[PDB]
Every structure is written in C-alpha cells, then in structure tokens.
Amino acid sequence: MFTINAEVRKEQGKGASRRLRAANKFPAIIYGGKEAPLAIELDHDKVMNMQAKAEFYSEVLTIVVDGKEIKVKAQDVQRHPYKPKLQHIDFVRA
Amino acid sequence: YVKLQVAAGMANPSPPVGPALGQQGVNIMEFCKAFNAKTDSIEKGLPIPVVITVYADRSFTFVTKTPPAAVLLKKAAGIKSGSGKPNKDKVGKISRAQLQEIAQTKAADMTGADIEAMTRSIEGTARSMGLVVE
Amino acid sequence: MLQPKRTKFRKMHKGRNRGLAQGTDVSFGSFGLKAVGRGRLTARQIEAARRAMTRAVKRQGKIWIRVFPDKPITEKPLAVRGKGKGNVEYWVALIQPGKVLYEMDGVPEELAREAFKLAAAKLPIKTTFVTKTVM
C-alpha cells in the first residue's frame, strides 16, 4: 500500500544534490531489469515518515513518477551521519 | 490508645496485657471476664482480635470477630517456627482437608455470591508460609 | 583503561581530525550512543562513561565499546623549555561526527536511554541516542 510520488531529476551531481536536500527533498535512483536507470527526487518528510515502518523495507512499493506507476523494492539507504534524515535511496525494480 | 495482641486466658500481666486494653480506658477485668466466658467455649489458646468500640470510664461493650487462620496451620505440621523465605524451604505441605477445616472458620461471615472463590484467599497465606496443596 | 598492548612506535604525529565517521550504525546491540561532535576521547573518559552506564543497568544486558584509544599523546614536563619530543602520558580515540561510541542490548529502551544519559555526562563531546535500523 506504500505509494511514493517522485519527480525526474533535471540536474545531477554534488551541487544539485545538496540544493535538493537544502530544499527538503532528496535524490534516489531506480535501477534493475532491462530498463535504463531513472534518477528521481523525493519529498524528505513523507518518505522519512514512511520508512519508519519496518514494512517499508520488505514490501513492494509503488513509485508514481510522471503518472506512471513503477513497482520497486527498497535496496539500499544512505542516512545522514548523525541527524534523523535520509541522503539517498536505491530502489530495485520489482 | 495503645493496642497490643491481648491474651485470652491471662488477665493483667504487666508487659503484654497491662497496656493492651487496661490502659486504653477499658475495664480489663470485665473484658477478660466476658470475653473469657466466650473463650471458655472457644478452643484452647486462640488469639482472636476483636474491634474495640469502648469507653474510658470502666464502661464497655464489644463486637465479635472471626477466629484467625494463620494460627491453626502449624498444628499438623509438627513445627512451631517460621521460614525466612518460603517457596524455597517448607514446614511440610498439609492436606486440603486441613486447609478446608481452616476455611470453615471464615465461612459464616461473608457476603460473596459464590463461596468457592475465597479458596484462593486462604491459600494466599498458605503460599506465603510454605503450605502448598497437592 | 584501554590502551594497546604493544605498538610499532612509541610516539605519533599530532595529525588532524577532519571528516565524518565510519561505523555509524548500531551493529551489535539494539541501542547506541552516537557522537554528534568532533573531538578526542581519553581512555579515562571512556572508562568513566563505561562505569556510569554499567552501574545504571545493574550489570544486566550487554555493552559494547565501539572505540579504542590507540593514539598516544605526549606532554612536556613543567619548567622545561625543544630537546626532543615529550613523554607519552595518555591515550585517546579520535572521534568524528556520526561515530557510534557504545552499544547496549538486553534492556528496555527507557533504561538504556537513562544509562546513556548518565554516560554522556562524562564525555567532552555532544552525543545522541540511536536505535538499530533494519536497513
């Protein structure tokens, strides 16, 4: 039942990623299968609240990007070194 | 008002009974005459603490109390001593017949709907002393 | 008081202490005390905090120390002017933000929080209470 709304990233790299996290979003990547990887931006507060549930890391999530729905599983998460924040997430296509 | 566990047969020994109720204001002689007539039919050596509703000028009248339960458990056990920590060492488990005989003492002065419930209250002190049922 | 049983060399350059820590996850227990600041932790401090923690939990559960004082620190004695490096006097662990310093298991979370607060009161660096995460 986990649904996450995402945007396609229009800029990549250190500066753009830091600007995202200063604007209270964070970057993430969807890869796997035969499709090309998709780099996305997520809303930090909503996703941070969702990932508190243990089922976030075991269930099949749905990421809505540009209207299309993609079934994924959380694969890796980079956390802030000491704040309760998220830096990045890997999603693998399910 | 100084209260102590008064004996039923002995009247006016200075240490244990003098300040028990003779110093309260109760006529100790008349109390240990009327309650003594009661304890003449009561069994030998049963300390039964009644609730005192008395005066201070040699006038008295008393209410009755149920005879206790913890005194009568050590008869068939053969030991007149207690354990520092029960459920580890016991004075010898006793019979449900003796436990029900003890419960018979506190059966005629209760308002419970079902009388079978209070079989656990009597064994509360049984477990607190070392008398575990079979 | 932790200190290496033996070392290749007696004395070490001062160096510096930049960067973020490695070892930022509760890896052995369920709860952790994590550094938020940057600094040095002396062996005496590590041991004072360990004592405080352990007495708070009444020696129940399990406690891990994730840091070890492997850097020797020299001092020059009083009233000395050069003339070679001073003498090793104590040992420290370098701490960067994010470093999990202690972990606990086998106790309730409230008790772990209390024990860790008592411990953090012995340390020269700001810290925060963390819990194990599944990923």
Place this chain on the structure above:
Amino acid sequence: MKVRASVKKLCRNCKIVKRDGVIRVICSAEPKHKQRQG
C-alpha cells in the same frame, strides 16, 4: 535557597516559574527544593 546553573524539578511538588527574568523552582512540600538560577 539553592543558587545553581542547573535548576530542575526535584519532586512532584516542585514547580518552575520565571520571575523578573530569573528561572526559579518553588516547592510546596519541601523548602530544601527552592532554587534560583544563578
């Protein structure tokens, strides 16, 4: 009166109050618990 940098409730009857820019602890049950930050 205790005068400390750290003033805290010491029992369920202690109350924190700020008077004239000063944090104080006032206790209905125990005079030993009276504190003022300073």
Place this chain on the structure above:
Amino acid sequence: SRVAKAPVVVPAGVDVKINGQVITIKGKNGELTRTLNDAVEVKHADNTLTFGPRDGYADGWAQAGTARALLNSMVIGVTEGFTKKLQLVGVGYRAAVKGNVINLSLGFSHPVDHQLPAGITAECPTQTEIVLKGADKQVIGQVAADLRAYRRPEPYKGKGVRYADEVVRTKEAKKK
C-alpha cells in the same frame, strides 16, 4: 482566555459605570474603581459584563482574563464583601481592636500598633482572633499579610500570627 470567556452577572442594586477604560462599581457595601489595561474591551450588554481583547495587542486575552477576574471580585466585594480571619498562637499573644488600630502583644518588649486602611474594619471576638472585613479583596489580603508579618508562624511549635485556614507544618528539634 477561558476565564475571560465567562461574563460576569451584575446583581440587582449594583450600578456599573464605564468611561473608556475606567470602570466604577457601586453597591450596598461601597464603591470601587479600576483603570483597566489598554488591551481590554469591556461591554455592559444586558446586566452582564463581557471582556475581550482589542485589536493590535499580543497579550489581549491574558489582559482580558485578569480584567474579568478583577471585575468579578469587585462585584462580590460590593455585594457581600470579603472577610479574613487570623489566629494568634503562643502564650501571652493577644490582640485588641480600638477604633481602626489593632494592638498586638506578640512577645516583643514594645507593643505593636497597626493602623488599618480606609476601607477595612477589624473585630476581635476572642483575644486570640482577628476578623477583617472589607470591599477590596487586594486590600484585605495586604492587611492580613502585614499582620502576619509581625510574627510569621515558626516551624517548631507553630507560634505566631497565622491565617485561620493555614496549614502550619511543624518539625521536631534534631536529636542528640
């Protein structure tokens, strides 16, 4: 806020007069006037005063709550008044009222003469009791506090001047 919400009823025989911020209350027990804080708007309405905040004031609701409490105390004061009772505890401690001066003997080498304010009266039923009466709650509280201050109750025998409804905790002198 919640205190300011509740309006205060004006009983029959009590006349209120609102002139901007100045409020005057007249009753069978006396006349009391108060200048309200500038953040408070008070409406007479229909035999019931209501209190609210004026626009542009950050503490308007707090000021309105205090204004409501004060006006309610004013109404009670002009209708039924306020009474305070003090007791003297200790051998030789005595009180007596003459006109509007309370004479206290409290173990000092000099007598105590306390002059009452304009609108406070005192009676001494017994030699160890003082009863104050007045229309101003704050004033009667101040007078009672001043009388108690001469000999505040002490913690080993409770001796001194105490409020009648005051719990005076005692303690025993340290052993040895």
Place this chain on the structure above:
RNA sequence: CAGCCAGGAUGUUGGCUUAGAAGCAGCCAUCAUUUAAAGAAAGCGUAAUAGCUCACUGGUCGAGUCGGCCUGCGCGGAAGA
C-alpha cells in the same frame, strides 16, 4: 486536559526479627477477595499502632488537550583592580 465531590475494605498486626514492625527499619511470599476499585502498599508520621493521603474506580463540568522530533531568534550560566 485541568478543577471540585466519594471510598482505599476481608483474610491481615501476611511471615521473619525485635522490647514492639501493625502496608509504610529491613528481608521472603507479593497472590486472592467482594467488587465500579485498592500496589500485602509512595513518602509523611507513630517507640511501634492509630492517623495522613498517593496509586487505584467514577460523578459533574462542554472544546480542545498532552508530550516527543526538527528548526529561527532570544534567556540564565557571566567576578577585577
């Protein structure tokens, strides 16, 4: 939520110990109970009981209330010729 109103009883002064320990020095059992409800009891207090009252259960009162997280600016911590 806060406020105000009622009870906290039966075994039982549980047992040990002590000159006495009674819920309230300490130690072990720490479970029932009628029931709307009561921890063999939170301190105070008694030489010790009595007493005090918390936990504990609701009756009124009619709109918000509680405390964690992050974050901006401020407060105390702050004594010298």
Place this chain on the structure above:
RNA sequence: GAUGUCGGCUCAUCACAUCCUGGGGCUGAAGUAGGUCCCAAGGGUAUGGCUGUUCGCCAUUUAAAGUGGUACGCGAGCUG
C-alpha cells in the same frame, strides 16, 4: 649610548572572590551558638618574642586582625 634589588619605614589608591559590622534563603536551625549559600565595598580591620626576612611559629589582644591589583605600589621620599 642603564627601566636601581629583597625586607623595613613613610604615604597610600583601587577591585571584591567580604575578615568585622548591615540585610537575607536553606539547615541534620529548640534556645545560645554554629554550618552553607545569596546581597552588600559605607566605614573599620593587633601589639609583641625569634629571624635580614616576606612568610611562619609562638605570647597576649580584638567586633575583626580579609584576599588581591597598583613596575611582586612607594630608594630624583628615608633606610641599607
């Protein structure tokens, strides 16, 4: 191409982290007498024996015999 030293004497001036005196909170504060903390710098704050001493010990006082800064105040003021 010189900024005279330790101690004493004479004369001081400031700070307050207060020795006395003033005001207060807590006390394991009965009283008398103390302990500890807060406020407070107005004024006050030993003479002798020993030693070059500062210091210190000792005798005997006092409400008390404060702690520091001032080129470890002060030798174009004295001593030496």
